[PDB]
PDB file of N, CA and C in Angstrom:
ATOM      1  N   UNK R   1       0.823  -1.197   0.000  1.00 59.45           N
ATOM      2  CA  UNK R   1       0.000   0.000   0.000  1.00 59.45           C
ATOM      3  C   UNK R   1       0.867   1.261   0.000  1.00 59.45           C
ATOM      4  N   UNK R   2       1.133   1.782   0.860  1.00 55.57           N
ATOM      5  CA  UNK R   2       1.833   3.255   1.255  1.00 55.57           C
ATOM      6  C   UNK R   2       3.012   2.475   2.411  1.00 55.57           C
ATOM      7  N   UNK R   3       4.143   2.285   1.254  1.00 52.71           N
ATOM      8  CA  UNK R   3       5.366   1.940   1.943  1.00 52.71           C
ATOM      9  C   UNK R   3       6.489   3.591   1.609  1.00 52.71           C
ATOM     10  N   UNK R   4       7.148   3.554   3.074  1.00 54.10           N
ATOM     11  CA  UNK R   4       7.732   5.006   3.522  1.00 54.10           C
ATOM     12  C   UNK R   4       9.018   4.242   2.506  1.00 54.10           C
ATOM     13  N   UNK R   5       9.862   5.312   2.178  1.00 51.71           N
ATOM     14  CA  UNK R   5      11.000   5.780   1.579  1.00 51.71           C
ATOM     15  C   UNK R   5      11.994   6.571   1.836  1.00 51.71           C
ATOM     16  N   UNK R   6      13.214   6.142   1.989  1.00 52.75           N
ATOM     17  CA  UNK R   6      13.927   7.235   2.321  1.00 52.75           C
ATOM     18  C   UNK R   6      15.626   6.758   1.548  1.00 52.75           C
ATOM     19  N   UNK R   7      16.364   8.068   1.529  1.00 53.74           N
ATOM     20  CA  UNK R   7      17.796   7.909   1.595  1.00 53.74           C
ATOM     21  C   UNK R   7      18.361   9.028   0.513  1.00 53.74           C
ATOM     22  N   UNK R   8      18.195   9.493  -0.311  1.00 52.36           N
ATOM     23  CA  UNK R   8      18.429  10.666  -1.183  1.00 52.36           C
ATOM     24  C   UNK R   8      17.893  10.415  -2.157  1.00 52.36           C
ATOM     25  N   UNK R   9      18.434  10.842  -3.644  1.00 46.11           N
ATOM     26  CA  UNK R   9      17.631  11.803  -4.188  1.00 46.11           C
ATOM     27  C   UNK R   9      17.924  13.594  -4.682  1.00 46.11           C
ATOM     28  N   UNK R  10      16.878  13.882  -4.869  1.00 45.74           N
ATOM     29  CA  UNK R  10      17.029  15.346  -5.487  1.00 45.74           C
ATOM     30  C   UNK R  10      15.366  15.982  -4.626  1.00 45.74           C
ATOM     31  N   UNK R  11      15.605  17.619  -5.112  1.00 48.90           N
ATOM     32  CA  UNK R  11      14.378  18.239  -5.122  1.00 48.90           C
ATOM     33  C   UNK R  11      13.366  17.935  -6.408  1.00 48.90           C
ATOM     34  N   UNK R  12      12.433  18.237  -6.100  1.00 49.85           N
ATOM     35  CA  UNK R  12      11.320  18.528  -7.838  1.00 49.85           C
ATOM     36  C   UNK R  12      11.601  19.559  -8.517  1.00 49.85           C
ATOM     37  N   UNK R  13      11.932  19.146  -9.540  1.00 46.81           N
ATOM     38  CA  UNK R  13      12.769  20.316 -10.413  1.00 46.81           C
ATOM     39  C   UNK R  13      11.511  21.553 -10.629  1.00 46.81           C
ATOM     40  N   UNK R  14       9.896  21.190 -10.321  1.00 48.60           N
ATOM     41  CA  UNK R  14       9.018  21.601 -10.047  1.00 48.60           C
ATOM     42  C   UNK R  14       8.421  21.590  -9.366  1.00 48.60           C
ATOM     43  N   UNK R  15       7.502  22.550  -9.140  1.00 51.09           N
ATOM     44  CA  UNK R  15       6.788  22.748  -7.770  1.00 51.09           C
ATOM     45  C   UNK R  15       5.112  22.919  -8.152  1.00 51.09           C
ATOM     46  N   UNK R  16       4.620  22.351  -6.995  1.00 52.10           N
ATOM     47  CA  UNK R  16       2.815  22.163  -7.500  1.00 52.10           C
ATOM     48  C   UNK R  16       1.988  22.605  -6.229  1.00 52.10           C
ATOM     49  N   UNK R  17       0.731  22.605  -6.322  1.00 54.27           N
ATOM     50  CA  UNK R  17      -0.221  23.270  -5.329  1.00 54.27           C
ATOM     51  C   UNK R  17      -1.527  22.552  -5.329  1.00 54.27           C
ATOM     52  N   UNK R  18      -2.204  22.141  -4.045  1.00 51.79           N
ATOM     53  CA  UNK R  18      -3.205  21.125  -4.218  1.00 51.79           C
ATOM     54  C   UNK R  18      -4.377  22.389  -3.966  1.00 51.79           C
ATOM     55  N   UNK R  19      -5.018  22.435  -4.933  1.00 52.43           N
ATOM     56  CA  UNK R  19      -6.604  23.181  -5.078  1.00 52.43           C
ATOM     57  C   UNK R  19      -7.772  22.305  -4.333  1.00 52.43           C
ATOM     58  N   UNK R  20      -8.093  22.203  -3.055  1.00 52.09           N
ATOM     59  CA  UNK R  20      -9.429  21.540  -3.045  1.00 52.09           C
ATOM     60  C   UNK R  20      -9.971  22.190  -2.622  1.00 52.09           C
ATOM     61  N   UNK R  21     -11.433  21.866  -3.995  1.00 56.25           N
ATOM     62  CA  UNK R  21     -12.878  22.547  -4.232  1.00 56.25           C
ATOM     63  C   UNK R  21     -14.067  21.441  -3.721  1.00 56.25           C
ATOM     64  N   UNK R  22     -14.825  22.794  -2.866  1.00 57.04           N
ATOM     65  CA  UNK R  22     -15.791  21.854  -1.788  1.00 57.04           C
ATOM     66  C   UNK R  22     -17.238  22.525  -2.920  1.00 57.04           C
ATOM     67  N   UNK R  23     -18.163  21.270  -2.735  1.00 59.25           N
ATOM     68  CA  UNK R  23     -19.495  22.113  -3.677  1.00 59.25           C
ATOM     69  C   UNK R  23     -20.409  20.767  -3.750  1.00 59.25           C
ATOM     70  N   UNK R  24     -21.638  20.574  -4.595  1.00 56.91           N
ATOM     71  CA  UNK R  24     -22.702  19.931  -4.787  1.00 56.91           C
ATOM     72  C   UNK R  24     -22.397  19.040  -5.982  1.00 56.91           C
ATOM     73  N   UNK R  25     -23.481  18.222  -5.648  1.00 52.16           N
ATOM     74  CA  UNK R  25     -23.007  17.674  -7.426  1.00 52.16           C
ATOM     75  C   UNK R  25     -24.329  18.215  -8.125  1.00 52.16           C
ATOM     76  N   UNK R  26     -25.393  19.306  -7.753  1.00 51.64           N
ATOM     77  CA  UNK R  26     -26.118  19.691  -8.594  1.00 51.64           C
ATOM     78  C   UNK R  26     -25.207  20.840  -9.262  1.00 51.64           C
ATOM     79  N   UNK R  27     -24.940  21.858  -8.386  1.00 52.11           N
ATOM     80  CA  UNK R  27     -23.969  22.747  -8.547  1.00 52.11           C
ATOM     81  C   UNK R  27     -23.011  23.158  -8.849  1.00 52.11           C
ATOM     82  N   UNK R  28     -22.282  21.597  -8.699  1.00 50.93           N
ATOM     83  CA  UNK R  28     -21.051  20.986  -9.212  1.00 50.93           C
ATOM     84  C   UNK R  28     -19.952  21.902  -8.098  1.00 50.93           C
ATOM     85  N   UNK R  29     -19.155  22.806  -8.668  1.00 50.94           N
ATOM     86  CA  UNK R  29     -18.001  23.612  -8.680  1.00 50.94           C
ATOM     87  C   UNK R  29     -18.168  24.677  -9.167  1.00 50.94           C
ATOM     88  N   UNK R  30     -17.365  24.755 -10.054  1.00 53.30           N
ATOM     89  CA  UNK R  30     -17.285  26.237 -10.479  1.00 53.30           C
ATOM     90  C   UNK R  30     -15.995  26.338 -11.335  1.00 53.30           C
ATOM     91  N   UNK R  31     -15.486  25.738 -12.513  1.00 54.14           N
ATOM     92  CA  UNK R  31     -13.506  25.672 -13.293  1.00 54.14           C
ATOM     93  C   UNK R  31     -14.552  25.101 -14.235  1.00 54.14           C
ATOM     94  N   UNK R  32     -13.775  25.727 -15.390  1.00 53.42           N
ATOM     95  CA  UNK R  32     -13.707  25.262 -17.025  1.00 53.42           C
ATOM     96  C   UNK R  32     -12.570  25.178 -17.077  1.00 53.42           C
ATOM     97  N   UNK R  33     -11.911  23.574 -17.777  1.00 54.08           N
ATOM     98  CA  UNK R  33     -10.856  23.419 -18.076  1.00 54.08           C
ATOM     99  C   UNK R  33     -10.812  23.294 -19.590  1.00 54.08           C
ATOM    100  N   UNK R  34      -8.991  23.527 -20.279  1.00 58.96           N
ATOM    101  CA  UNK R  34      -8.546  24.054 -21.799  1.00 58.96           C
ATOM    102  C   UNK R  34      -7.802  23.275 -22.060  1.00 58.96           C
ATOM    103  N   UNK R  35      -8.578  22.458 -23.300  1.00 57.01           N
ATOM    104  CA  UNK R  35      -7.626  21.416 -23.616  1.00 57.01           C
ATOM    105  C   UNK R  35      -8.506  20.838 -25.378  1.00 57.01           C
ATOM    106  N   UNK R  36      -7.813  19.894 -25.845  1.00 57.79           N
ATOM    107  CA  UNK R  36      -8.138  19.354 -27.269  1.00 57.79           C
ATOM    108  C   UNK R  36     -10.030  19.839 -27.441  1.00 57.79           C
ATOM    109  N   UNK R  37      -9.772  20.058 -28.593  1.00 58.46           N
ATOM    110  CA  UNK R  37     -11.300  20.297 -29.153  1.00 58.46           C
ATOM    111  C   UNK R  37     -12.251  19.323 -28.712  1.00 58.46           C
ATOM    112  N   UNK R  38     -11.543  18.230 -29.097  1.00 58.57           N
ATOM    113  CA  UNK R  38     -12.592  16.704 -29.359  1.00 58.57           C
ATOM    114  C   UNK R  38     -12.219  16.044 -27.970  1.00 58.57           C
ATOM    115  N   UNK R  39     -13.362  15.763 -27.370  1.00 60.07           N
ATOM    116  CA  UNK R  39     -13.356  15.201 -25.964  1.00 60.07           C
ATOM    117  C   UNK R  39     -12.839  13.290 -26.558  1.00 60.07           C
ATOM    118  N   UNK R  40     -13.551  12.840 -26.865  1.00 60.69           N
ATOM    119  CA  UNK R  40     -12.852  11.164 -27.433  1.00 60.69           C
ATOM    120  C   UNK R  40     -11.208  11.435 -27.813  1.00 60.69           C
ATOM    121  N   UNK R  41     -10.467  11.563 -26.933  1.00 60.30           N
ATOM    122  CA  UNK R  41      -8.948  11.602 -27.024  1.00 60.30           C
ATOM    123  C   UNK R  41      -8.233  12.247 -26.029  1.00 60.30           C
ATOM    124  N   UNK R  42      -7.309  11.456 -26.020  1.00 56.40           N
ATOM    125  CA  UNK R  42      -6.009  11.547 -25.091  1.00 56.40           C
ATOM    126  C   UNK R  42      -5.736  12.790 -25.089  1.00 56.40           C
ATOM    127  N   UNK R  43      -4.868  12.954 -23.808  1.00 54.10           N
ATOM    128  CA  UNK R  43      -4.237  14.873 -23.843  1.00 54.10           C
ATOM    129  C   UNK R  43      -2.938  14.568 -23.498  1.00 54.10           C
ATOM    130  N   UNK R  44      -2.204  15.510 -24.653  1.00 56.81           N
ATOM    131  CA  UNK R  44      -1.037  15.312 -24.730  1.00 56.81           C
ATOM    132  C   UNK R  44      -0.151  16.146 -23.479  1.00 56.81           C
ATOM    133  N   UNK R  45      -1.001  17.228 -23.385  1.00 56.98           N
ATOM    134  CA  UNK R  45      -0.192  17.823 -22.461  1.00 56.98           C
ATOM    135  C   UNK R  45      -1.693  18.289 -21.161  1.00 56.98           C
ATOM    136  N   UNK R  46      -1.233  19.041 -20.086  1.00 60.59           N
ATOM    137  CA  UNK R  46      -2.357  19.289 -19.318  1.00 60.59           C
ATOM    138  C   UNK R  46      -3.429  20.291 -19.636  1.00 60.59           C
ATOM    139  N   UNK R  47      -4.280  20.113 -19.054  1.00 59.82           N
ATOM    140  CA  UNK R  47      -5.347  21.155 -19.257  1.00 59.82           C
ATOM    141  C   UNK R  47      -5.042  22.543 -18.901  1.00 59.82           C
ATOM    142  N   UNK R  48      -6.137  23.581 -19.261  1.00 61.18           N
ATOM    143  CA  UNK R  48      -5.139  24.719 -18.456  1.00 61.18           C
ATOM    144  C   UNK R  48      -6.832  25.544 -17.953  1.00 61.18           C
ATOM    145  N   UNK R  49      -6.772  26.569 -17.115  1.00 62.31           N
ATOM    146  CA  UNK R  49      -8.084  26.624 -16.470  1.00 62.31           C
ATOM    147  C   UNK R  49      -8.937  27.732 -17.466  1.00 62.31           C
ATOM    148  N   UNK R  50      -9.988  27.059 -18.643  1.00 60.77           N
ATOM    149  CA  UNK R  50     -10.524  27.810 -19.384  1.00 60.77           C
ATOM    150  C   UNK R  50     -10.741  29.143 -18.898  1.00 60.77           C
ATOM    151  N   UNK R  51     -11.910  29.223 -18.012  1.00 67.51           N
ATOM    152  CA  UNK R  51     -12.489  29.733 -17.260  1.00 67.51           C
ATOM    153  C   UNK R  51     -12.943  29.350 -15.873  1.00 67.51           C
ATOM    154  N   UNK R  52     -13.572  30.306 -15.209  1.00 66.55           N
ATOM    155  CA  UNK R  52     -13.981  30.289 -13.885  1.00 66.55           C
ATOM    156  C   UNK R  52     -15.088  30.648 -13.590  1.00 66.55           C
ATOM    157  N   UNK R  53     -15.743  30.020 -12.512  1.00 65.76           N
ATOM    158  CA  UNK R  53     -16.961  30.621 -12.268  1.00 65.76           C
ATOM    159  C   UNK R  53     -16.496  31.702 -10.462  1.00 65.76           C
ATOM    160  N   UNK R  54     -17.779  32.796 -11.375  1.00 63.78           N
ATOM    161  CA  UNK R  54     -17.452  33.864  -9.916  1.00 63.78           C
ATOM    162  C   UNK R  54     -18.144  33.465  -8.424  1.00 63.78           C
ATOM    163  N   UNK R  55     -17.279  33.915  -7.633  1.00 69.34           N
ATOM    164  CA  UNK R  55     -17.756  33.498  -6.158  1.00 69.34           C
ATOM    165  C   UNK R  55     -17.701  31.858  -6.126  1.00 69.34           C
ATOM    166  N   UNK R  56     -17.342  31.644  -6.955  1.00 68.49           N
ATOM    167  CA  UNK R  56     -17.450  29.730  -6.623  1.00 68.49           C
ATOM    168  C   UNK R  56     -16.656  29.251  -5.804  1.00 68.49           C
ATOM    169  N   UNK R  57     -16.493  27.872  -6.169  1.00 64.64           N
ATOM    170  CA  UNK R  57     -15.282  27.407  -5.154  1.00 64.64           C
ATOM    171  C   UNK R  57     -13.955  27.748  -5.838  1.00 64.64           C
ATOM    172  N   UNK R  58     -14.116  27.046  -6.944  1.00 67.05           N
ATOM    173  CA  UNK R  58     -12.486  27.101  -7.495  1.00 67.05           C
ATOM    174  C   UNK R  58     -11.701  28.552  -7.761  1.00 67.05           C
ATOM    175  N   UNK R  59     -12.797  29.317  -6.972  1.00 64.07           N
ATOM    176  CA  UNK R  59     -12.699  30.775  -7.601  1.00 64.07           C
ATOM    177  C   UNK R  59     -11.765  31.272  -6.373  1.00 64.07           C
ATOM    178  N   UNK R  60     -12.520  30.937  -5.036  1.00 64.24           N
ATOM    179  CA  UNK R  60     -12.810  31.088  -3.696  1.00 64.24           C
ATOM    180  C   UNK R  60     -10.890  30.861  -3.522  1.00 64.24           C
ATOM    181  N   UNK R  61     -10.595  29.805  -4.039  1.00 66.67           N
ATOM    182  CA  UNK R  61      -9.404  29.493  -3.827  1.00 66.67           C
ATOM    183  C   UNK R  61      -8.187  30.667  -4.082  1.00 66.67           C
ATOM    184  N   UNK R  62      -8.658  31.236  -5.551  1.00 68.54           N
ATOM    185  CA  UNK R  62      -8.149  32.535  -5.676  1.00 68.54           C
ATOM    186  C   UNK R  62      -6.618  31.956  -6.353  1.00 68.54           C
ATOM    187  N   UNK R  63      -5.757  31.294  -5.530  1.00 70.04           N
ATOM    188  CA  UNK R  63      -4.925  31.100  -6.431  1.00 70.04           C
ATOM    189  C   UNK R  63      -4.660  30.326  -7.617  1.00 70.04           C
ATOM    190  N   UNK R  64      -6.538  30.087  -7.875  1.00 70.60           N
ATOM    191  CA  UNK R  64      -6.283  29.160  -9.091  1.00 70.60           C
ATOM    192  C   UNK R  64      -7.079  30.512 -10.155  1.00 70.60           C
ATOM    193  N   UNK R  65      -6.611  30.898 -11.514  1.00 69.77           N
ATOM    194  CA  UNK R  65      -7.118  31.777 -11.902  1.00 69.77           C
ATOM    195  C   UNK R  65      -7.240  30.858 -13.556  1.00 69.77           C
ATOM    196  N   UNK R  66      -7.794  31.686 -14.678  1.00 68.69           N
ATOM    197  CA  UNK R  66      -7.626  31.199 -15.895  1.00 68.69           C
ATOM    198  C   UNK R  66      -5.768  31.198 -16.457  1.00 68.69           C
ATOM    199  N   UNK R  67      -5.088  30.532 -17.198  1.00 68.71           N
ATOM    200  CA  UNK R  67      -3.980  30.045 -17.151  1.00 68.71           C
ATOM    201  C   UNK R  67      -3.658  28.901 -16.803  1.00 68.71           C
ATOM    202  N   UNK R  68      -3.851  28.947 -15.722  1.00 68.47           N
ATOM    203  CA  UNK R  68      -3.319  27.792 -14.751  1.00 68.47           C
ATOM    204  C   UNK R  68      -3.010  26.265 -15.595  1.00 68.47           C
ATOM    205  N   UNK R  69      -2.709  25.223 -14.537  1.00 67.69           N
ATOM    206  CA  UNK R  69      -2.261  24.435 -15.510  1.00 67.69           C
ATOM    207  C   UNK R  69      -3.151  23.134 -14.609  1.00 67.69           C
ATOM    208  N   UNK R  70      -3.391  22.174 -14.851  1.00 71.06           N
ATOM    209  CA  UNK R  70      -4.501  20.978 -14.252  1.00 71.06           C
ATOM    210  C   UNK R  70      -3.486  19.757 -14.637  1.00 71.06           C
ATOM    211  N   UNK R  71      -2.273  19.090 -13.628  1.00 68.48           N
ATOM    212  CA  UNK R  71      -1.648  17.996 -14.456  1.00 68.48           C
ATOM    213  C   UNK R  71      -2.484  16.748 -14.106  1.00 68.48           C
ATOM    214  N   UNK R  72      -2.827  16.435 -12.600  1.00 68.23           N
ATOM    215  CA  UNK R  72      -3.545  15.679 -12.173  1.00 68.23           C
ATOM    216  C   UNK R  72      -5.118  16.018 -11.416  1.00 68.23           C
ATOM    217  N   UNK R  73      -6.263  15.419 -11.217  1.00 71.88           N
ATOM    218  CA  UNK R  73      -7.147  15.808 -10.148  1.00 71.88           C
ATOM    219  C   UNK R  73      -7.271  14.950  -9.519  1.00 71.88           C
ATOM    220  N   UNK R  74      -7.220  15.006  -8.306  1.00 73.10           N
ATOM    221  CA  UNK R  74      -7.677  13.440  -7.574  1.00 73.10           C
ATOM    222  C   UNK R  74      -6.615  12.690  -7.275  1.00 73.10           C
ATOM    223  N   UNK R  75      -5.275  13.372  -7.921  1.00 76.52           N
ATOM    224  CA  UNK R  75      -4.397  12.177  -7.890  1.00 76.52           C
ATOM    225  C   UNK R  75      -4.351  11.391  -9.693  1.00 76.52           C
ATOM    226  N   UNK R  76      -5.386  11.875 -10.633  1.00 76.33           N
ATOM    227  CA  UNK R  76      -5.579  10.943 -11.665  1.00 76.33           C
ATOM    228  C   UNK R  76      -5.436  12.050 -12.530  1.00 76.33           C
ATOM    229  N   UNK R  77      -3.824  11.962 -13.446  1.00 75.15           N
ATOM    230  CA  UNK R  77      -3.062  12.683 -14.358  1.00 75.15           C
ATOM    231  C   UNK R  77      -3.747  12.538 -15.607  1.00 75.15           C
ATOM    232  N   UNK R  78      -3.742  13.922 -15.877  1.00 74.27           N
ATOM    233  CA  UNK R  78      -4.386  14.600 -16.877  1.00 74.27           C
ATOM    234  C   UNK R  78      -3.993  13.707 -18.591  1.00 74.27           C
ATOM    235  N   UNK R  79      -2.850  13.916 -18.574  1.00 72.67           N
ATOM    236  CA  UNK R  79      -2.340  13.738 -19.455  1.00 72.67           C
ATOM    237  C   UNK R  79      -2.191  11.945 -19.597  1.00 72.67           C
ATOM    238  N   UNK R  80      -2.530  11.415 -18.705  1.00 71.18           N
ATOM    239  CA  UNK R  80      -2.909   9.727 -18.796  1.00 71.18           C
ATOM    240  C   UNK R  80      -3.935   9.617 -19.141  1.00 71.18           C
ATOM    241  N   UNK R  81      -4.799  10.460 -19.565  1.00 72.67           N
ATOM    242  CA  UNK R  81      -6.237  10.440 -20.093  1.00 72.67           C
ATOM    243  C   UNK R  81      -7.048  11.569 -20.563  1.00 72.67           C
ATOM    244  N   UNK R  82      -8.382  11.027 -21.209  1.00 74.51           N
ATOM    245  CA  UNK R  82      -8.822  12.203 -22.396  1.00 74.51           C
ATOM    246  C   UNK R  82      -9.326  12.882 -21.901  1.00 74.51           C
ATOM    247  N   UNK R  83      -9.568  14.647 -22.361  1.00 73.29           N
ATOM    248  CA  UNK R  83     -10.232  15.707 -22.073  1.00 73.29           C
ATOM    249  C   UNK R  83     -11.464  14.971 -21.223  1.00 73.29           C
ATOM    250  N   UNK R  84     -12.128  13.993 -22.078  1.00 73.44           N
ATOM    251  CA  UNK R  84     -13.367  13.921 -21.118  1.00 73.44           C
ATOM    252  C   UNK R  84     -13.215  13.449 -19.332  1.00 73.44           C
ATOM    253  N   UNK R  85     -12.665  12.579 -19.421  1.00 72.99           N
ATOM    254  CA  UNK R  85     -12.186  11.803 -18.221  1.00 72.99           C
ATOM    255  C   UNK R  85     -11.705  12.993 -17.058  1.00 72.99           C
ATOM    256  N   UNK R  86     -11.176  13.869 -17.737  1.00 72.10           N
ATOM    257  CA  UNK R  86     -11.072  15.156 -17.079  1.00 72.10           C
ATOM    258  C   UNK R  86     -12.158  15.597 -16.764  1.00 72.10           C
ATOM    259  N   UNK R  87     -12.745  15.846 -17.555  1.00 71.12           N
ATOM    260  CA  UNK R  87     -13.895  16.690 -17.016  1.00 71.12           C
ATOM    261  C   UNK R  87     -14.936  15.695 -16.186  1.00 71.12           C
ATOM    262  N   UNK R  88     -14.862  14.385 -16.439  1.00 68.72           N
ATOM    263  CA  UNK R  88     -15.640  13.413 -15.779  1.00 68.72           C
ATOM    264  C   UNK R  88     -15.066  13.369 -13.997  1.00 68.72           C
ATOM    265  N   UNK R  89     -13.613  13.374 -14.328  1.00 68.16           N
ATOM    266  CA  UNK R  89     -12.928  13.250 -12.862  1.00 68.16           C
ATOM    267  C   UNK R  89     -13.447  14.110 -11.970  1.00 68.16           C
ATOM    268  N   UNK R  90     -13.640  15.434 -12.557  1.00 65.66           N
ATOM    269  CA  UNK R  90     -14.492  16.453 -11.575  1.00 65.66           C
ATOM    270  C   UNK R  90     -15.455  16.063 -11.240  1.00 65.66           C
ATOM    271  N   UNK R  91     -16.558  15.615 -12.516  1.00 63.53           N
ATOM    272  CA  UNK R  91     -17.716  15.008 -12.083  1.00 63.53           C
ATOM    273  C   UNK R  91     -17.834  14.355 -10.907  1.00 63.53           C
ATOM    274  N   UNK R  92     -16.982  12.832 -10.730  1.00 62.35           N
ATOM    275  CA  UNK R  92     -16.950  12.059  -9.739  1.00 62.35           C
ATOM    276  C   UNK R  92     -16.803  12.956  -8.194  1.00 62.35           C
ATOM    277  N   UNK R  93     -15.583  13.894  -8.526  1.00 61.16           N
ATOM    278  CA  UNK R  93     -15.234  14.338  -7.633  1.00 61.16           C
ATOM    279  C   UNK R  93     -16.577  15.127  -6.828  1.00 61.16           C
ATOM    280  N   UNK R  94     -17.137  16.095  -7.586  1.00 56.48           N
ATOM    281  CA  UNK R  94     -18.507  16.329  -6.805  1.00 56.48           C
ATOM    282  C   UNK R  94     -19.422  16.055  -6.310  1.00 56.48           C
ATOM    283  N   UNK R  95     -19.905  14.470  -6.718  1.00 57.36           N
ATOM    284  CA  UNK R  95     -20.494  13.822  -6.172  1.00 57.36           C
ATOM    285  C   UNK R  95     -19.726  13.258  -4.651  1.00 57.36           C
ATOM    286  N   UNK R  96     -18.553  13.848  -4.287  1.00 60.63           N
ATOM    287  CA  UNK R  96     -17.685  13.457  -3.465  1.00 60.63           C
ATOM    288  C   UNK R  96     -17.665  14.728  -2.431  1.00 60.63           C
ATOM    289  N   UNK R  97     -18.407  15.695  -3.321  1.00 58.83           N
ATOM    290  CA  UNK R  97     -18.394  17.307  -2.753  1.00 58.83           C
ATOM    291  C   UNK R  97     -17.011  17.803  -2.380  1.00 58.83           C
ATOM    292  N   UNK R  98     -15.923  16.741  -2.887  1.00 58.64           N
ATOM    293  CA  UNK R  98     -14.949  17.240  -2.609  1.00 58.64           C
ATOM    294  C   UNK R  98     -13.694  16.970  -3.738  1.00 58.64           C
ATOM    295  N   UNK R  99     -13.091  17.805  -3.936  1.00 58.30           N
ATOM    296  CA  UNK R  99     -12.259  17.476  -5.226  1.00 58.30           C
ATOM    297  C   UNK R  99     -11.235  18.158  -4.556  1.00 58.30           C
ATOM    298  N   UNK R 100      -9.431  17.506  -5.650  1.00 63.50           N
ATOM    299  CA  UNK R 100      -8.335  18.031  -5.582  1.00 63.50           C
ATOM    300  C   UNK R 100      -7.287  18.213  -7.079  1.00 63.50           C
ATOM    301  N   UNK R 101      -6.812  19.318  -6.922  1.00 61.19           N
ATOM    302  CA  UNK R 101      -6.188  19.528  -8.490  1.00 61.19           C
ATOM    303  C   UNK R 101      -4.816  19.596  -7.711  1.00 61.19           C
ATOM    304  N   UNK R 102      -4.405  19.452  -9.106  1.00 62.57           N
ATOM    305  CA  UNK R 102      -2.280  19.932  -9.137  1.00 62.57           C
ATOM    306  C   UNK R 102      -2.197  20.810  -9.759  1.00 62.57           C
ATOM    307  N   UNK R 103      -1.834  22.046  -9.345  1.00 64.63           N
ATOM    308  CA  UNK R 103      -1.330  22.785 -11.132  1.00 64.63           C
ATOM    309  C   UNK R 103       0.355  22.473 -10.874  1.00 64.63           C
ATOM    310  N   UNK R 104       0.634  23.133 -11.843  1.00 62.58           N
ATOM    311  CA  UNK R 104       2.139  22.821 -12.473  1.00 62.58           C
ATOM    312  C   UNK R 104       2.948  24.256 -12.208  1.00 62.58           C
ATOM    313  N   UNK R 105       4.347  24.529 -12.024  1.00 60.65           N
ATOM    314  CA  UNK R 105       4.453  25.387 -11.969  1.00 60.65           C
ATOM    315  C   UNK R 105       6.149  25.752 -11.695  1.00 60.65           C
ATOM    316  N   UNK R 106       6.817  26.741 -11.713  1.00 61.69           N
ATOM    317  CA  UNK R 106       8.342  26.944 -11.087  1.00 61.69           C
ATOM    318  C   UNK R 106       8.258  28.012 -10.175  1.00 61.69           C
ATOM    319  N   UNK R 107       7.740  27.742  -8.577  1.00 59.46           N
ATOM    320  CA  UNK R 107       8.040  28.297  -7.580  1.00 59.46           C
ATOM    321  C   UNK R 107       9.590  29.211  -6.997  1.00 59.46           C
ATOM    322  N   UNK R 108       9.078  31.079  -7.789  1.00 60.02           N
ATOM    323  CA  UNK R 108      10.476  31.051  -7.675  1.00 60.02           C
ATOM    324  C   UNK R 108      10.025  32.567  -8.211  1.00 60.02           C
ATOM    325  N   UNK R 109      10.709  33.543  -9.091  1.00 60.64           N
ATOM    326  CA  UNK R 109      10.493  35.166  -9.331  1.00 60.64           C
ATOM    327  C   UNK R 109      10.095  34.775 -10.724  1.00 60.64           C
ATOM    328  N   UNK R 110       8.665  34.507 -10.742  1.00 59.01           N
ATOM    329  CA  UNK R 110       8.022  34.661 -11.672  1.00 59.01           C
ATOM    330  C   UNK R 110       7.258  35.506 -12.003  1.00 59.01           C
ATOM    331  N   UNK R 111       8.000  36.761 -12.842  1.00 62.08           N
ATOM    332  CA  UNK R 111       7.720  38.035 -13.433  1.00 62.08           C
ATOM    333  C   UNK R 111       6.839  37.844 -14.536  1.00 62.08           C
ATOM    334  N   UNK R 112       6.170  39.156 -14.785  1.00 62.84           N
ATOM    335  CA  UNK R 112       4.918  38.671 -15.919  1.00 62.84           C
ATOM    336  C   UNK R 112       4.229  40.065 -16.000  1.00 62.84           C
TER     337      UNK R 112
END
């Protein structure tokens, strides 16, 4: 199951942030995610956050804005599966009223 690890190694040459969005499953959430046109297919790379809904949850979080990047939710990587499954993963997740994202990112003087 969850066997501990230790002895070296490196840092993550990247750095990530867990988003969890609390909500309904009538209501769902509140994130549009950006990715391949055609939902029947794989994603090559991650989603990125279409849009947002205001006052929502994923909104609420604040540090998730449009840009952003979606590699995994739940633990279940974006890019191991198709746009839909993405958007399905949320699904599940709300019926869970509780969901978790990764974005992607280099924690560090990111000017813009």
């Amino acid at each position: 199951g969850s066997s501990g690890s230790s002895g070296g190694g490196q840092i993550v040459h990247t750095e990530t942030t867990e988003v969890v969005l609390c909500g309904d499953p009538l209501s769902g959430f509140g994130l549009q995610l950006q990715g391949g046109i055609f939902a029947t297919e794989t994603l090559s790379s991650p989603p990125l956050v279409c849009f947002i809904e205001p006052d929502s949850p994923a909104e609420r979080c604040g540090l998730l804005q449009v840009g952003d990047r979606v590699l995994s939710i739940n633990g279940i990587a974006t890019e191991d599966g198709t746009m839909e499954e993405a958007n399905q993963l949320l699904r599940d997740a709300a019926l869970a009223h509780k969901v978790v994202l990764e974005v992607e990112f280099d924690s560090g003087p990111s000017s813009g």
